[PDB]
Design a protein around this ligand. Structure first.
Ligand SMILES: C[C@@H](C(=O)N1CCC[C@H](N)C1)N1CC[C@H](NS(=O)(=O)c2ccc3cc(Cl)ccc3c2)C1=O
Ligand SMILES: [Ca+2]
Ligand SMILES: [Mg+2]
Lengths: 234, 53
């Protein structure tokens, strides 16, 4: 995350972190239930064997609230394409159930119609992760969050050098130096409604980080609510 | 603005218009209160809430 601020104690409990063989984070995820994680399809080709860490806010030290879970089943959308990044979504089933606690809790899945008319018409959403704090820097050792304005669909289309499909949406700033970045992919985009946070997107891609005339591109969760429900049963 | 378009129909969470009337509902892990509008967490760590303990 470029700009924004630190997630303070208990503020981002749905954040998950995918860690490689060296125990280093390479992507994010969203906790949906005791057995399921939401992530990006493109994150699956960034490591061979990986696990999931929950409850962490500072990767420099183990304070005691962190827990690691192995992945039982990887459910990747069969329509994902590296060429356009369309259908950038995956669901992970864990071997053991997550223990909800301070800094560990699921985000709410909304219903499709209501989410589109009421959540996605709000002024902003919240993106979070352990990714880079600048386009060329190293990954953040602290979990960060950032408020990002929803961006008009037409304006986003005009600004992009790659096709913006109906399975995607745009959020962030034209020129202001705040955006998601490398390592944040797969993580949560949530929208607050009366002190309750609902998952509205998955961190997907951007032409670099926080560039002028450029926005952040997120997988549109509402397009995949039935698919998610089906993945959480089978 | 009428029904679900006027302040979310007074609902805490989901709002639906059924036969020209407001109907509220809640996410999994909440139950609708007796007033038919508020959403009550059924147990510990309900979805979408920042943790306090
Ligand atoms: C255009 C796209 C790319 O190479 N693509 C996507 C279009 C299709 C093409 N085949 C691959 N790119 C360019 C490099 C960039 N990688 S990044 O690590 O800087 C990155 C990753 C995810 C991001 C998410 C948000 Cl919301 C904002 C900024 C981000 C920056 C990246 O993703
Ligand atoms: Ca830690
Ligand atoms: Mg910009």
């Amino acid at each position: 995350i470029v700009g924004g601020q630190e997630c303070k104690d208990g503020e981002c409990p749905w954040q998950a972190l995918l860690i490689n063989e060296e125990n280093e984070g390479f992507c994010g995820g969203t906790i949906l239930s005791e057995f399921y994680i939401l992530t990006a399809a493109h994150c699956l080709y960034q490591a061979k064997r990986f696990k999931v860490r929950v409850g962490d806010r500072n990767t420099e030290q183990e304070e005691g609230g962190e827990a690691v879970h192995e992945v039982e089943v990887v459910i990747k959308h069969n329509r994902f394409t590296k060429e356009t990044y369309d259908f950038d979504i995956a669901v992970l089933r864990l071997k053991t159930p997550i223990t909800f606690r301070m800094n560990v809790a699921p985000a709410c899945l909304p219903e499709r119609d209501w989410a589109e008319s009421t959540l996605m018409t709000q002024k902003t959403g919240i993106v979070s992760g352990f990714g880079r704090t600048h386009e060329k820097g190293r990954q953040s050792t602290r979990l960060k969050m950032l408020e990002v304005p929803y961006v008009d669909r037409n304006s986003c289309k005009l600004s992009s050098s790659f096709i913006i499909t109906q399975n995607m949406f745009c959020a962030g700033y034209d020129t202001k130096q705040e955006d998601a970045c490398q390592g944040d992919s797969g993580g949560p985009h949530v929208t607050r409604f009366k002190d309750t946070y609902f998952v509205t997107g998955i961190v997907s891609w951007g032409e670099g980080c926080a560039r002028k005339g450029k926005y952040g591109i997120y997988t549109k969760v509402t397009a995949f609510l039935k698919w998610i429900d089906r993945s959480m049963k089978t | 603005r009428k029904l679900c378009s006027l302040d979310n129909g007074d609902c805490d969470q989901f709002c639906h218009e059924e036969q020209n009337s407001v109907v509220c509902s809640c996410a999994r892990g909440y139950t609708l209160a007796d007033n038919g509008k508020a959403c009550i967490p059924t147990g510990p760590y309900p979805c979408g809430k920042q943790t306090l303990e």
